[PDB]
Structure formats: structure tokens, C-alpha cells
Amino acid sequence: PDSLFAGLVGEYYGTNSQLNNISDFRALVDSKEADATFEAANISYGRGSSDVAKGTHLQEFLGSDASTLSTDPGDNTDGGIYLQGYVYLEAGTYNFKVTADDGYEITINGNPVATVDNNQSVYTVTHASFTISESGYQAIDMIWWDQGGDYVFQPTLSADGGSTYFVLDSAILSSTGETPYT
Ligand SMILES: O[C@@H]1[C@H](O)[C@H](O)CO[C@H]1O
Ligand SMILES: [Ca+2]
Ligand SMILES: [Ca+2]
Ligand SMILES: [Ca+2]
Ligand SMILES: [Ca+2]
Structure with missing residues (x-):
């Protein structure tokens, strides 16, 4: 049985190898069990300095969301998160606008909708729009990492053509696709 909560299932992975791109982080996720798990209920993280993978920076x-950490990871030089679950969206057009250091990839219903495939100091990208064909809980996943130094990750989403944006949080997230009453 997987827990039902108003959030995405979060996994954190650390490494002492360099993360240069999305492929490197995905390979890290493939390589071992998560260094910690957590509930991602308010997906607006950072900013901070001095490596996300060191000390209490995570x-x-x-x-x-840190009060749901399964453990306190040890130090690593590089690290990142993998989030997966569901997000309630009505049928229509949307676009992400994401502030991040380093890179990231967000997919909805298996398709990438926001990608930065490299390291970067803090930068905000307004991504291309995408459509949702049927109202309901949509599958969503995210990866984000820090190669070192500063770190921040704030995806925001617009339903109104980029006029207003919102953070993905417990109002609309579901870990399993069932309706959370938490
Ligand atoms: O946080 C930043 C970014 O990772 C940049 O890519 C290198 O410098 C680090 O300090
Ligand atoms: Ca794994
Ligand atoms: Ca730690
Ligand atoms: Ca590094
Ligand atoms: Ca960084």
C-alpha cells in the first residue's frame, strides 16, 4: 500500500560524482535506492548556498516538506530530487515558468513540458504551452539537481496564458491519483 497524501512522492539522491545534465541525474536515480524520501506538498524550494547535498542544506x-524526510542524508558534493505522482488540472492550455539552479525536467502524462538540460546559476525560463485533453488527475514527474554552489527550484504553472502563475501544492497534488482529504 502506497500512502495517500496531497503531494508528490519525493526521492532525494546524493553523489560525489558530477551532475552535468538530466541524463546524469536520471542515471543516479537508476543506480541505487533513494538516500531519503519525503512528501512534496509545496514545490517551492530554496534558495540557498554551499551545496544542497552538504549538511542541513536539503x-x-x-x-x-522537510518534516517528512525519512532520514537525514549524509554529505555529498552533488544531489537532486525526483518527484512523481498526480496533479489535478482541468482540460485546457497551460505553461510552466520555472526558476532554478541547476537544471530540471518536468513531464506531464509522460511528455516533457519544461526542460533545462544543463547547469546554471539561478535563471527563470518561461516554457512553451501544452494542452490537457481531459479534466482530472494528470500524471506528473519532476527531476531537479544541484551540481554544487547555490540551489533553488520553483516551478510555477499558468492556466491563463501567462498572466498569473501558481505553485504546485496540496491544493491540487495527489500521491496516488485518489482524492486526498488530509
Ligand atoms: O550554483 C551555481 C551553479 O551551479 C553554476 O552552474 C555554477 O556555480 C554554482 O555556484
Ligand atoms: Ca532508485
Ligand atoms: Ca545531511
Ligand atoms: Ca559537482
Ligand atoms: Ca548549483
Whole structure:
């Protein structure tokens, strides 16, 4: 049985190898069990300095979500997160606008909808629009990593053509696709 909560299933992975791109982080996820798990209920993390994978920087980064950490990871030089679950969206057009250091990839219903395939100091990209064909819980996943140094990750989503944006949080997230009453 998987727990039902108003959030995405979060996994954190650390490494002492360099993360240069999405492929490197995905390979890290493939390589071992998560160094920690958590509930991603308010997906607006950071900013901080001095490596997300060192000390208590991950806790600080995750903020409001860190109280659900399964463990306190040890130090690593590089690290990142893999989030998966569901997001309630009505049928229509949407686009992400994401602030991040380093890179990331967000997919909805298996298709990438926001990609930065490289390291970067903090930068905000307004991504291309995508459509949702049927109202309901949509499958969503995210990866994000830090190669070192500073770190931040705030995807925001617009339903109104880029006029307003919102953070993905417990209002609309579901870990399993069932309706959370938590
Ligand atoms: O956080 C930043 C970014 O990772 C950049 O790519 C290299 O410098 C680090 O300090
Ligand atoms: Ca794994
Ligand atoms: Ca730690
Ligand atoms: Ca590094
Ligand atoms: Ca960084």
C-alpha cells in the first residue's frame, strides 16, 4: 500500500560524482535506492548556498516538506530530487515558468513540458504551452539537481496564458491519483 497524501512522492539522491545534465541525474536515480524520501506538498524550494547535498542544506531547501524526510542524508558534493505522482488540472492550455539552479525536467502524462538540460546559476525560463485533453488527475514527474554552489527550484504553472502563475501544492497534488482529504 502506497500512502495517500496531497503531494508528490519525493526521492532525494546524493553523489560525489558530477551532475552535468538530466541524463546524469536520471542515471543516479537508476543506480541505487533513494538516500531519503519525503512528501512534496509545496514545490517551492530554496534558495540557498554551499551545496544542497552538504549538511542541513536539503532540509533548508525543502522547508515545509522537510518534516517528512525519512532520514537525514549524509554529505555529498552533488544531489537532486525526483518527484512523481498526480496533479489535478482541468482540460485546457497551460505553461510552466520555472526558476532554478541547476537544471530540471518536468513531464506531464509522460511528455516533457519544461526542460533545462544543463547547469546554471539561478535563471527563470518561461516554457512553451501544452494542452490537457481531459479534466482530472494528470500524471506528473519532476527531476531537479544541484551540481554544487547555490540551489533553488520553483516551478510555477499558468492556466491563463501567462498572466498569473501558481505553485504546485496540496491544493491540487495527489500521491496516488485518489482524492486526498488530509
Ligand atoms: O550554483 C551555481 C551553479 O551551479 C553554476 O552552474 C555554477 O556555480 C554554482 O555556484
Ligand atoms: Ca532508485
Ligand atoms: Ca545531511
Ligand atoms: Ca559537482
Ligand atoms: Ca548549483
